[PDB]
Write an enzyme that holds these catalytic residues in place. Sequence first.
Site, mmCIF file in Angstrom:
data_model
loop_
_atom_site.group_PDB
_atom_site.id
_atom_site.type_symbol
_atom_site.label_atom_id
_atom_site.label_comp_id
_atom_site.label_asym_id
_atom_site.label_seq_id
_atom_site.Cartn_x
_atom_site.Cartn_y
_atom_site.Cartn_z
ATOM 1 N N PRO B 160 0.809 -1.229 0.000
ATOM 2 C CA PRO B 160 0.000 0.000 0.000
ATOM 3 C C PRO B 160 0.845 1.282 0.000
ATOM 4 C CG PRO B 160 0.219 -0.789 2.231
ATOM 5 C CD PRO B 160 0.944 -1.782 1.360
ATOM 6 N N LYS B 185 4.454 -5.669 -6.265
ATOM 7 C CA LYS B 185 3.816 -4.562 -6.968
ATOM 8 C C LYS B 185 3.667 -3.412 -5.976
ATOM 9 C CE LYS B 185 -0.149 -2.157 -8.373
ATOM 10 N NZ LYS B 185 0.195 -0.917 -7.631
ATOM 11 N N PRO B 219 -5.892 -2.097 -10.847
ATOM 12 C CA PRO B 219 -6.712 -2.880 -11.785
ATOM 13 C C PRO B 219 -5.996 -3.647 -12.905
ATOM 14 C CG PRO B 219 -7.681 -0.701 -11.454
ATOM 15 C CD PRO B 219 -6.313 -0.681 -10.811
ATOM 16 N N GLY B 238 -4.347 -3.006 2.005
ATOM 17 C CA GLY B 238 -5.059 -1.891 1.411
ATOM 18 C C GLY B 238 -6.509 -1.830 1.874
ATOM 19 N N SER B 239 -7.378 -1.319 0.995
ATOM 20 C CA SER B 239 -8.777 -1.115 1.335
ATOM 21 C C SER B 239 -9.479 -2.468 1.448
ATOM 22 C CB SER B 239 -9.452 -0.228 0.322
ATOM 23 O OG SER B 239 -9.472 -0.837 -0.964
ATOM 24 N N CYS B 295 -4.144 2.134 9.162
ATOM 25 C CA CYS B 295 -5.192 1.127 9.282
ATOM 26 C C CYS B 295 -5.653 0.970 10.743
ATOM 27 C CB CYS B 295 -4.643 -0.162 8.686
ATOM 28 S SG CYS B 295 -2.961 -0.496 9.284
ATOM 29 N N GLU B 341 -8.238 11.891 -4.469
ATOM 30 C CA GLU B 341 -9.301 10.934 -4.160
ATOM 31 C C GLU B 341 -9.482 10.789 -2.642
ATOM 32 N N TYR B 343 -8.240 12.920 -0.238
ATOM 33 C CA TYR B 343 -8.598 14.245 0.249
ATOM 34 C C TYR B 343 -10.098 14.512 0.105
ATOM 35 C CZ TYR B 343 -8.609 19.447 -0.336
ATOM 36 O OH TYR B 343 -8.918 20.777 -0.344
ATOM 37 N N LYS B 345 -12.608 12.259 -0.225
ATOM 38 C CA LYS B 345 -13.301 11.324 0.662
ATOM 39 C C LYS B 345 -13.321 11.828 2.116
ATOM 40 C CE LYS B 345 -11.830 7.109 2.178
ATOM 41 N NZ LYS B 345 -12.435 7.048 3.535
ATOM 42 N N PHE B 394 -9.567 7.490 7.183
ATOM 43 C CA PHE B 394 -8.190 7.488 6.704
ATOM 44 C C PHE B 394 -7.723 8.939 6.525
ATOM 45 C CE2 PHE B 394 -4.841 4.814 4.588
ATOM 46 C CZ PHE B 394 -4.900 3.713 5.412
#
Lengths: 493, 493, 493, 493
Positions: B160, B185, B219, B238-239, B295, B341, B343, B345, B394
Amino acid sequence: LPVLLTDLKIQYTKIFINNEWHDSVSGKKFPVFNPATEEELCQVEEGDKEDVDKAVKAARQAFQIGSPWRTMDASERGRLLYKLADLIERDRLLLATMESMNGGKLYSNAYLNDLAGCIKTLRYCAGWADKIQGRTIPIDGNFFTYTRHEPIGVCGQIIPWNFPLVMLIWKIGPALSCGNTVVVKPAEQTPLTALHVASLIKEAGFPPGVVNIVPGYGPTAGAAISSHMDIDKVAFTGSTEVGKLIKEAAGKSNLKRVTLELGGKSPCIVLADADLDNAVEFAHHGVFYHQGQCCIAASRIFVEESIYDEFVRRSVERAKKYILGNPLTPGVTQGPQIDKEQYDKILDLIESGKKEGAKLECGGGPWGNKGYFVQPTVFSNVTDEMRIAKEEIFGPVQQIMKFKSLDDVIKRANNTFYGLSAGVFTKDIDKAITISSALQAGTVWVNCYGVVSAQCPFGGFKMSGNGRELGEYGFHEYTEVKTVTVKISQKNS
Amino acid sequence: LPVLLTDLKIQYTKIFINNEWHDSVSGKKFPVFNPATEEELCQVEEGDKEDVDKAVKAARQAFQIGSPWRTMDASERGRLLYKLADLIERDRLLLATMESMNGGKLYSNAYLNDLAGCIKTLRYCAGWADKIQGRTIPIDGNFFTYTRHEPIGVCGQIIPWNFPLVMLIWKIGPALSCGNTVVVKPAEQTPLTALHVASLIKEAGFPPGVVNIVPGYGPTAGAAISSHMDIDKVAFTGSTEVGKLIKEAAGKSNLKRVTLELGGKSPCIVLADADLDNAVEFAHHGVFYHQGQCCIAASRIFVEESIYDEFVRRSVERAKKYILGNPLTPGVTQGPQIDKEQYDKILDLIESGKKEGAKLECGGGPWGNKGYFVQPTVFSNVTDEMRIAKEEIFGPVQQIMKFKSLDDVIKRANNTFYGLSAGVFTKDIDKAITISSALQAGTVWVNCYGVVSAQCPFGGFKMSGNGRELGEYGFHEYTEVKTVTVKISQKNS
Amino acid sequence: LPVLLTDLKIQYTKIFINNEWHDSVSGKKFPVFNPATEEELCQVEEGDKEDVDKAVKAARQAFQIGSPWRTMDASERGRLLYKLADLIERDRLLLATMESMNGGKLYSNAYLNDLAGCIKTLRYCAGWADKIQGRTIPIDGNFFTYTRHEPIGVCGQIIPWNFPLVMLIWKIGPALSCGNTVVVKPAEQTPLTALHVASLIKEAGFPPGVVNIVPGYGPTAGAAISSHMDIDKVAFTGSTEVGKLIKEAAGKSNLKRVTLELGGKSPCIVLADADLDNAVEFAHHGVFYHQGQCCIAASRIFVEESIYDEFVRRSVERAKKYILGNPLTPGVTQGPQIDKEQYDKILDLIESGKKEGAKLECGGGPWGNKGYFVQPTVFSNVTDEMRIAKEEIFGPVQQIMKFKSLDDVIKRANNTFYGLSAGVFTKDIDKAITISSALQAGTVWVNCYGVVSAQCPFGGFKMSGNGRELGEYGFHEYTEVKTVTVKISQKNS
Amino acid sequence: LPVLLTDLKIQYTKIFINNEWHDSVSGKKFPVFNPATEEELCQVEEGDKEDVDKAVKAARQAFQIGSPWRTMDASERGRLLYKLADLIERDRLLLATMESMNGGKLYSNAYLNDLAGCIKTLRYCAGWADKIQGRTIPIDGNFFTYTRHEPIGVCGQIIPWNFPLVMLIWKIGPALSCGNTVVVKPAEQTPLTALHVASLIKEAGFPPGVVNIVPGYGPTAGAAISSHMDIDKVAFTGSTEVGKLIKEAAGKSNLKRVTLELGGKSPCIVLADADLDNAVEFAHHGVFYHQGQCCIAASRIFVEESIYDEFVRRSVERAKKYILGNPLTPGVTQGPQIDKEQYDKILDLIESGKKEGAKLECGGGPWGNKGYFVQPTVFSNVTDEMRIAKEEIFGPVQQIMKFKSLDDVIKRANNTFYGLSAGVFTKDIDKAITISSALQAGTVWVNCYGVVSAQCPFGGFKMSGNGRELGEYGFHEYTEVKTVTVKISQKNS
Ligand SMILES: [Cl-]
Ligand SMILES: [Cl-]
Ligand SMILES: [Cl-]
Ligand SMILES: [Cl-]
């Protein structure tokens, strides 16, 4: 080998929730058959999503902090499992009859080898209850850290049809030893032994809702368990195909923990130096045990060129000695397959073997006017591209292959998506250790096959599974590790 | 706190496979930004399905039986990890600068608390390499049984953006200690520190293909890893939303092992008897660490009625002392959020808090003309149905709730699908042990919060994760347990 | 194999207490000799009861609750051991020269095989420091129970002369990893390497009084350690004779814990089917390593009748290839015995071999005008009643015996009060496992001999010792298990 | 609480060897008495050196490789222990009567708390038999290494008089679970329960010679066990004085392994903040359990100045409520001391308390015209130099001391050669953890005392013992660790 001196009367046919017997919410029932005669044994209550929801609510209530199951001593959970073992031992004749009659299992094997494994595994699991320990940890800084091995919560357990009573105890034994509550879905083919054992859980004196048993079908009750938002862990044994659907639905719902025990295409490797009679007998019993309906069936036997012809000859001699019939009748040494779907799949694969140019040595067809019987079948000169060398048959069908190079045979043994088990036959210490290290398989037998005991972990590499059952290691997947870190004034070593 | 006396030049921007630097198969690149200034730092090679396939083939080749990585001693794997730790220690100034500059992390914290955790965790993981042991087992019958703890194989690891370097080492450290090979990754927001560490893996002298690093988008490259038919295990942090997609795609492909570390909505419980200044400071640092992008953020603080008003007052005093700006500038005590994104949220959730009738005590809006800064925000009088009490923010947003009954507050603390962590503040021994036993959370801190060290296992209950990282227990999920059973003439105890 | 390009100057000759150099309380010194030339190397301070009392007071002060050594993190104890390993690695040339020059050890072996074992074992011990864990226990009743693995306290460690530096690190490495403080008494023959390492402990930055080194004689300083009322544990390696006096004096004083690593009369069993060249080379290196001055020397080699004559012939060919001389000179392949007492004992036992009617095959006498050299000696046709088959020789003397029956040879192999080690040579898997199970010996090698590594426990059955060194298991004897049981209101699983 | 409805007839009075009843070699017998009435119960065969030699030969024969005990499955050793537990449960009334009648133990406590501990501990030990595991080890080089946890051999076990049946099972349970054979010497005061249990070992179906029971005196039969050249391990519980003689004689003979559980002078520390009624009741039951004849008796209770007067007052109120008499009679709440020697020692120490200037609060003298009864006694204002604060009394005598400083009281608590147990009474989490870390005692209770269960290790620091009994950790001292290292062609991880 004693026998049940009365014809069996089936008693427990209903859904088991909170130590009481329930009709299905729908009111629906489904038939259960004897596969040797194809006649109905009884009607059983058909559980669905509504019945699973009721069982999970009962299991969640029994798992609440401050409940009887959560407050009793670890040693008392053990006592209840050891008490249940003594009651299974008391009902060994009628459970083995029901296993043979419903599952198509040889009675001798159901009594002497399945019920003995049930009793032994339960007694072993009882012994772990009060020895499951966490850790105290020498963490950096002025802190005291420890772990609890807590139970996970409500555990959904889907039992297969091939070993109904043995696989029930391999699931509930570790789950209850670690202090979880369970919702069990036995196989649609074989619910009867699981419901008898529910009656014994009530009698042993487990608190209500700790064990709940919901019989029903895979796409309905099984999918309800895998997709439920309040089941914490799902254990499934069965086909690799359904395994993929269970793990998919756990992701899409509540990221419940998933353990899987799935198919195999397990190799034996028989080297030139092997005790040939010992290897023939173990590779034979390896594939033909319970009419080949074992995930660990020795379905690819690779034999070194120099001893290949003698191996095949002695294998065929052994396979022509079987006597087919009702598995309750004395003298009978091979029972039926479980149902028509499995029977059709086996004969379809035997036909590909002949067609794709494997050498049929014996068998190769059905037997009898009723019951789902397959003649015990041997194929020699099998190649790696044939359907019978790639697909799980789950029938009494032995494949025997040739090799010359040991480097090459281990490549061929490992060239599969499966990886549950392997057998290596050799006299040589180096070869035993190096071949067992090189094979990508969860269980390696050397100079034996199909030796499975409660003290050892068992499970697949690759698409044969996720996680492990039994032994020390198998109890890890029924606990949740909780770390507790406490601030203190000064730490001293 | 030393500082880098030269402005940072970024060097490693490419895909890392077989200890060499590769352009993307497509030829495509993607930009990387500084979130304090919103300006481009460099272009990085965009990995996709074709680049992951090349990395997995390299990792599979390095994992072959008889390879350098598989034949070297367990102690030598340890030596390479301890050598890598010494090189990370050498490059601590430039790695902490890159972490601060790319991740928006306070420089003081990146240098003194992230890089120290990286070095400490690697040294700890090095120490396990040659102490990972299986079992010899006293199985029934005339057999000798043992287990190998083998490595699993090729491990796909998705890192992440919140702790890019720390989470890289929490994944590669256990994976390589146990003898696996890895395809990494890193997050699309934050690839730069992972690629610098790849340069140090080459320098430490790992065999080629043991570590491969493929930067790219979730993705495309992330889905390629999760769906690949020759990756044996996938680790994702992650999420909770993407976690569900990773575990779904593992089911649909090759039943690869899945470990997940996901979101939280972590409670603190502060009892009447707690040291109030100690509880205010730890619950504060608990939520505001790294701009709330943890988290484990202490996002629901329950305070007993009698001390509630004093807690809120002292909390607001503490939250009004922050100085916002570029996280590389001395004196600055809060940096930016990672991207637009996140910020958006955070400000959307702050607006629900005000609207649904929470009391805004301080902050509650953006800051500045550039960079994604949120004022540190406190809400009092929060109720359990509000969006800010249910959803992971978050961001730097503290929720403070009231309770009177301890039975009731533990019900409310547990009424979530999350379960990563919890904090309990009390002077009482009974309350510390009984509340830590009752909370369904993977880490419990008592009288502290956010104390995370390499020696302790860490991970979620419920939808906060599957499995555990670090400690003894975390290394279990990077081994595959292989049972070996050998027939012998007579067993003797 | 690099060499020290300057003639060695010895620097550290004094008692080491509280990281400072002390003269003896008496003022007395004792000489240290080179056994290849019989000339004095230096004078060393002679410790006695008064010097041990001062060292134990310093070690007890450094072990007090709240001290630097007791308050530092477990990981920091590890860091100091890994730092010390790096300094031993830096001083590898001069330590190996000092080991060869003082101990009579081949330089090639001191550099490539003793100092490599020192560095490897220290690095392994460093790795355990922060992974020593106790247990949380699911005790009956409303209690929370855990264990601490605490350090024991002040540990008295008596080092032998045969492996002075290796045995120093096998003792201090586990003791300090577990957090004890130590008082070391090196052998009177060989104090010099231990005092150099004391200088490196000070340099690595251990707190004062954690390691104290008191050189001196066995009946004075050694008896003072074994009888002291404030030493918590004594570790001794040496003769079975002195071992008995150490364990007697621990009983009569303060019931201090006693671990012993003592003599052996270790068998090899070579079966008819063994790789004969592999067995000849390993049984040879087994007995002749470091001029036979190994507790694990392969001093009774039993060979099956059919291959006996060929074994003896090839053994004698190998034993006639040695070149005796100063162990620092290139090309030399056998150094001297340690001192006159050992030299006299070896020649006295060789004379009994000849007299009692063993067949002398080669050697059988002294060599040279100075230094304590024994010709490498082989005896065939040895019987179980001969002195050379019953008594530890601790010299370069190989005994080769005949057998026909495997039942009989294991009886003869086990008919000794010793039980440190054994070697079995066979190609057969059954024979490897069943003979290793039947031999009453702490280490069994199969198809090798003398393979000793840090990851494995090592120690004797019967009068060869009490307890174990190194591996996981060896660290148990340097901790004290403390149970803590806390009353809580209600327990939940 | 049920009772035995017939007056007890004693049956088993002889030496038990090879599952048969033997007269003594000498022909001699010795009397056994009831300590409440001082009248003879029966004559028992007096074992000596000749009888121990016969028992050790039988135990060595039953331990031979290839014997029934060595060849049966680990799970079958477990089955025999669980079977023996069920037979002890069947004979619970007559064993508890015999324990009360012979040992002077309250019948209620012998039935509800000693026999329940016997059954529970045996069932726990049964559970370990097939879970005792060694290790597979990732050793450096081309080798496969594993450990066996083998049994040690013939184990000599000397049982004390204070807990005759409980301490018998704490010794034989772990010894037999690990697969050893045993020679038991029960206390001369209390042989009768051990010989009844021998009859049940024969009935459970243990192979002959696995358990042998030789009653007799300490200086004769006990010294014969400690000095025997073919006993591999000796376990002793009793006085620190005899403990020293046992460990001395093990050194002088065959360096047999020695575990010791010896005396204590165990402290309680009661802080100002403690629940005072909870602390008074637990410190009271701590010292007065079984007439103070517990190694763990809470014989030094330190109470903070501010609550000291109230503690003493409530303690004396509790101590004046006892009813002395025959321990078989309903309503009786304190039985006699074991014999005249112990009775004389207790009254002699009470007289020093009065003389050296302790304040006698209640009791302080004998009771009755027959039986060895001591009035329950309380001393306040005790100082650390008094005989009653330094020497183990082993009688119903409570010492209560004052402190002001917590640093000071832990110094005073630790200023003893003993170190078996300690109790800490506080409400504070920090104080519980830091005081339990600082006390040099094997068991710490916090807010309770005398809570002893099978799942937890138990044993002394310093002169209170060597080694540990029960729990995971206690089974280590009944195995011998054997390393097996096998050469292989190429190792793969
Ligand atoms: Cl395992
Ligand atoms: Cl853990
Ligand atoms: Cl071990
Ligand atoms: Cl422990």
